[PDB]
Amino acid sequence: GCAPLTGKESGMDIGRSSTERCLPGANPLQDQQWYLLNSGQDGFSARGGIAGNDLNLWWAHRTGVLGQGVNVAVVDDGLAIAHPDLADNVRPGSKNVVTGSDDPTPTDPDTAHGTSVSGIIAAVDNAIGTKGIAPRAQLQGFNLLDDNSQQLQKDWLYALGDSNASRDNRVFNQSYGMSVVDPRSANSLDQSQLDRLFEQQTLKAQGAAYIKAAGNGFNKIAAGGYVLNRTGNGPKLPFENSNLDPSNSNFWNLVVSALNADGVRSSYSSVGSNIFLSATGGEYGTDTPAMVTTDLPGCDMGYNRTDDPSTNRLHGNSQLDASCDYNGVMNGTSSATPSTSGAMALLMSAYPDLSVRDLRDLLARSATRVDAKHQPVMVSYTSSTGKVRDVKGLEGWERNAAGMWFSPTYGFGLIDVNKALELAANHQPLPPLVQLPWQKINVTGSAAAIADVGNSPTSSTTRIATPLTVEAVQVMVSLDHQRLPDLLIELVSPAGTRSILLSPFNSLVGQSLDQQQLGFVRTKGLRDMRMLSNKFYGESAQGTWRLEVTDVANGTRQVSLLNRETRERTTLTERNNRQPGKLISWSLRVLGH
Ligand SMILES: [Ca+2]
Ligand SMILES: [Ca+2]
Ligand SMILES: [Ca+2]
């Protein structure tokens, strides 16, 4: 009841509420994949969301744009390559790094994450199960995250493009990330080696798009042998800012946040200045929709199996899924990532030979400005000189000096595949990427001081002399401070545009953790911590850029701890610094054209 379209219907409304909006196909579960097309259906959960909040890909599907000829790598916990709704799309070259074989299928029943990821991207278009976002894309799986994987550098390289088997993928799906309580540098040998690989693979003629989950730490993370979350008084700032995983600021990664079926940020989604776009991840599939996708086959394996019940109605279900080959509980930025990988494969199938940067440009300029009125999250405190200040800790939607709308929650906005394809038709390639040399400032004197609940930020500046249009900016920062989450770290462009690189009250509570279990503190502060902002996309680079750091808190905070080994619950107390912090150095790298 949804016919094929040609290229060439005049008067075609490609939008989210068009009368032409429908998905072709005979996949029995596709009408409960709200992420393909959101009609307010419940995804087998207790209730539906709001119609239109989806990837707006229906016109791609109707015109036969389906991911044909695009190779997607799923680097994850496994991939059941024989799955009845995946096998047709599996091409040769998967590697099981636990067994040595070509078959990354898991043998552990809980290891269903990568198979669920794969279905969102490329479940086969046929008369069973679901329909993938890009149902003619071809998959490989590399099970780097199986419980018994050693997660060896050699295998990460193999899976992310540095072997014969994987080099000719044009999309790398990384539904994974790191949570931390102490800051990390991005300069380790292993990290820089992967960054060199991602640079090579992105910028070459057959260029590959790396896609990366922002994290699911808005409220809780697991790190250091614990599950941690804040409790008590406090602003609604993410516990995990998306700039914390050092990998998320490497530029080559397109980092995505998760959106739910109501058209707002998924409760758990990490956010920050480095989010490029928002894509569909849902909630939990219990009370509200999550991602209907391919499960490990059988009722003894996967997220849909007898031993791991769910209130999602697809799971118990002899009528709709008698061999428990599908599930309704897949979620997370882990799901926003394949939603993005799928969108990217659709674009690449229509316009092969546009660069990754051009595809980013199209995705950014075509994104939907969802949740347009969400407010900034403010931090109020009495400053050191007696004045109450109320400053942004996280922005809402803001328009930069070049006219581009951006938010740390949604990036440039929710993916709109149909509109990206409309823009692509007459898109002129961007000029080649220019990566300006790093500019490092070594800060000295009384300008280094960061006062407790400062009345003004501590500022340090550097002038970019080169005319350039900005795409992204990277910063590295070094400072001393005895209670890191008190710090708000911002970057200001020559136009006066601001971007919060690190929101305060994040998960960097490890100094307090160390005091409690060791009796001393290992972390003095940030050391070459990398952050990235997309806020400045389109702006002129020439002029003075300003790093501004403020300590915005002198009150005590409590953090709840759950010991992962011993389910014992304890309480961590962050006590105020009581010696002023110190900026040591920072570096700026402008990436543009
Ligand atoms: Ca199917
Ligand atoms: Ca199953
Ligand atoms: Ca403080």
Secondary-structure map:
Elements: H1 58-63, E1 71-75, H2 113-122, E2 138-142, H3 153-159, H4 164-167, E3 171-174, H5 189-203, E4 209-213, E5 220-223, E6 226-231, E7 253-259, E8 277-280, E9 291-294, E10 326-330, H6 333-350, H7 356-366, E11 377-382, E12 388-394, E13 398-399, E14 405-406, H8 417-424, E15 434-435, E16 439-442, E17 449-450, E18 458-464, E19 470-480, E20 487-492, E21 498-502, H9 510-517, E22 525-533, E23 543-551, E24 557-563, E25 569-574, E26 581-592
Helix pairs in contact: 2-6, 6-8, 7-8
One calcium ion (CA) binds next to loops.
PDB class: hydrolase
Keywords: serine protease, Protease
Assembly: monomeric
Note down, in words, how this protein is organized:
The PDB classes it as hydrolase. The entry lists the keywords kexin, hydrolase, Protease. The assembly is monomeric. Crystal structure of serine protease of Aeromonas sobria. This protein has helices at residues 58-63, 113-122, 153-159, 164-167, 189-203, 333-350, 356-366, 417-424, 510-517, and strands at residues 71-75, 138-142, 171-174, 209-213, 220-223, 226-231, 253-259, 277-280, 291-294, 326-330, 377-382, 388-394, 398-399, 405-406, 434-435, 439-442, 449-450, 458-464, 470-480, 487-492, 498-502, 525-533, 543-551, 557-563, 569-574, 581-592. With 593 residues, it is of the alpha+beta class. The protein folds into two domains: 18-429, Peptidase S8/S53 domain (Rossmann fold); 430-593, Galactose-binding domain-like (Jelly Rolls, Sandwich). The strands form seven sheets. It has a six-stranded parallel sheet with strand order 2-1-3-4-7-8, with helices on both faces. Strand 5 and strand 6 form a beta hairpin. The site of one calcium ion has 8 residues, from loops.
